[PDB]
């Protein structure tokens, strides 16, 4: 028994248990950006930028 | 028994539970973005740029 | 039994329980952005940046 | 809209999420009972004895 | 809009999220009872005796 | 709008949310009774004796 390295994690979510009981929901945009409710989400990047949950209102670039 | 890098885990979601009770629900847009209700996702890139839930307003690039 | 480096964990979750009872919710937005509502998330980023509930109301670059 | 005793409920179970990762899993029995397991169940009795996971190693009733 | 008695709820359950991650699990019974997981149960009973998760070694009886 | 005695609960269970991670469990049993692991139980009784999780190692009635 060697184990070289081995029994890794990176991103990992295990486990998870939830409950969301809401009556009334709303969401009104005009323009923009909204993100609600992400939940048990695993990533991973190499040689990149990551991101999970990213809003922006608008993004210019002139020139 | 000897394991070599190995039983590695990247980008992993498991035993997730959820209940999502909800009596009314809207979702109101005049352009821009919306991301609701993301779960149990998982991802992995290379050599690349990730991302789960990104919202953008609108991208502008001119010249 | 030798155990060169491995047994590790990086940007990992387990083992998360959660209720959220909301009779009424609302969210309006008019230019900008808005995140809520991210729970068990978990993300490793190599050679690039990482961001997990980023809001930006607007990115202007001009020249 | 008036409403005599009306939307009721007795004996109710609704929105139940439910994982169960189990690698080995033994029962040994010898005589006698074992109930093991037992999720989501709902029961109404009306002029009786009700049970649900019940066990009993031997009733005996001599005379 | 009158509402006699009405609306009512009795033994219910519901909005539940369960996850149970077990490796190894043993149960090992000589005579007598085991009851083990029992989740998510709702019963109502009249004019009789309720029982949810009852265990008895034996119940004998002479005369 | 009026509302006579209504809207009541009486032996109700609602938003729950549970993780157990056991890696080994054993219940080793010789006679008498074990109850173990009840979870989100609800119950209402009329005219009757009620028990939820009752062990009993055994009941003698002689005469």
Chains 1, 2, 3, 4, 5, 6 share one sequence.
Not at 20 to 34: D, I, L, R, W, Y
């Amino acid at each position: 028994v060697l184990y070289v390295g081995s029994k890794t994690k990176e991103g990992v979510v295990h486990g998870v248990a939830t409950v969301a009981e809401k009556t009334k929901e709303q969401v009104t945009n005009v323009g923009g950006a909204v993100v609600t409710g992400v939940t048990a989400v695993a990533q991973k990047t190499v040689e990149g930028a990551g991101s999970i949950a990213a809003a922006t209102g608008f993004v210019k670039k002139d020139q």
